[PDB]
């Protein structure tokens, strides 16, 4: 240790005018005791099998050398505090050095973790390591398929379970897709089965077939082992067909189930704009297609509603800028559906869903950039769509923020 730190300590104690040989005598004695303890604290690190040298190793190394692990305070009577340590304090250099005494009481205590349990698994089966989640990772000859019989038994069973005849079968197959480590090298056949399926499954609008395939896409995405952006190109079209294309079945009823699938599709669309991102290829391409779907005139109100759902779930900055200028076209479309008597078509249902989603999204956008003053009739400057009900939604958001 440096001697110019030892003279600062001495003159801040009342011992002034110390010589350099007196001061060098202090810094070779205490630097030995640090070296004697750190060599002795490495014994507790090597028998604790942790190669870490935690803060408690010096507490036992001090107690071994008959020195109290007491730090920052030394009791000359020893009777109140013996060789038991006080685990020091939580330290940071960047601390505040003054807290309020009711701030420490009102904070929630951390969760005591689970107790130690003994689980057994298999490192090796007769020499081979299994791929379980407890483990880390002139005629030309007649060729063999690159899948094993069993690798494809998995496939045929997983695909026949993922078409959702039974719900428990689906859910396991979806978890199996979500965490099989060896599901690479089968992934072309899964991507082709998804893509091909949606395209011949929108010829007749079979909603379950589509809701099961979208859940299969979601189960493919959250698997951490497999490399997906080689099959990224098929991802944008397959989800988009369910969310914005017309429904060949019944638009008015099954639309609620269609909407659960719609939410799944917007979540996958956000994943596409969250993962797999490079410069100006994926997110901007789907944003441009969504906007020219919106600026589209007399679009299938199913498509229009789907395009609105796609443009709505894109995040914080997207929605505010995109909706701002449109504050009139949406209202005019709603007014046309209202005036024309035609009720047996799906136009009225599409209009109500679009207006509710646009209004609900507007409330955070308004709650996010501006105070909640004049929430009664100022929204009549924005054609009076949501008005006081929009203000009530903003108030509910403020209450949720207060709860947080």
């Amino acid at each position: 240790l440096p001697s110019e730190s030892m003279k600062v300590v001495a003159e801040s104690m009342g011992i002034a005018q110390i010589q350099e040989e007196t001061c060098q005598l202090l810094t070779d004695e205490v630097s030995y005791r640090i070296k004697e303890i750190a060599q002795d604290a490495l014994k507790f690190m090597h028998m604790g099998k942790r190669q870490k040298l935690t803060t408690s190793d010096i507490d036992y190394a001090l107690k071994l050398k008959n020195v109290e692990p007491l730090y920052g305070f030394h009791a000359q009577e020893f009777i109140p505090f013996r060789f038991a340590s006080g685990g020091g304090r939580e330290l940071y250099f960047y601390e505040e050095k003054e807290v309020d005494l009711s701030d420490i009481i009102n904070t929630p205590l951390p969760r005591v973790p689970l107790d130690v349990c003994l689980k057994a698994h298999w490192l090796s089966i007769e020499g081979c390591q299994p791929a379980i989640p407890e483990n880390p990772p002139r005629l030309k000859p007649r060729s063999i398929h690159e899948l094993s019989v069993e690798q494809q038994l998995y496939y045929k069973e997983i695909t026949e379970a993922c078409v959702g005849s039974c719900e428990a079968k689906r859910a396991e197959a979806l978890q199996s897709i979500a965490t099989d480590p060896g599901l690479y090298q089968m992934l072309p056949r899964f991507s082709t089965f998804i893509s091909e399926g949606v395209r011949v499954n929108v010829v007749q609008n079979n909603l379950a077939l589509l809701i099961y395939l979208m859940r299969m896409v979601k189960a493919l995405m959250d698997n951490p082992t497999l490399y997906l952006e080689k099959y990224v190109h098929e991802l944008i079209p397959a989800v988009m067909t369910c969310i914005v294309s017309r429904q060949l079945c019944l638009r008015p009823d099954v639309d609620n189930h269609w909407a659960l699938r719609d939410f799944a599709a917007r979540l996958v669309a956000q994943i596409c704009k969250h993962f797999s991102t490079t410069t100006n290829n994926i997110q901007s391409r789907i944003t441009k297609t969504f906007t020219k779907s919106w600026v589209d005139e007399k679009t299938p109100w199913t498509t229009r509603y789907g395009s609105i759902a796609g443009l709505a779930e894109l995040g914080h900055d997207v929605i505010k800028t995109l909706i701002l200028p449109r504050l009139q076209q949406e209202g005019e479309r709603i007014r046309s559906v209202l005036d024309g008597p035609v009720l047996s078509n799906i136009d009225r249902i599409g209009a109500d869903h679009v207006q509710s989603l646009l209004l609900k999204h507007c409330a955070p956008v308004l709650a996010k950039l501006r105070p909640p003053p004049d929430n009664q009739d100022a929204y009549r400057a924005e054609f009076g769509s949501l008005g006081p009900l929009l203000c009530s939604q903003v108030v509910k958001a403020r209450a949720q923020a207060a709860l947080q």
């Binding site: 990224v232 988009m240 490079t278």
Partner: peptide
């Protein structure tokens, strides 16, 4: 950097916007 493998993956180079079927007729 324009020779990076991703540039050549066909998600970043293709018309999958047409593959989206609106009103299958």
């Amino acid at each position: 950097d324009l020779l990076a493998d991703e540039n050549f993956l066909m998600v970043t180079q293709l018309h999958w916007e047409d593959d989206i079927i609106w009103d299958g007729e």
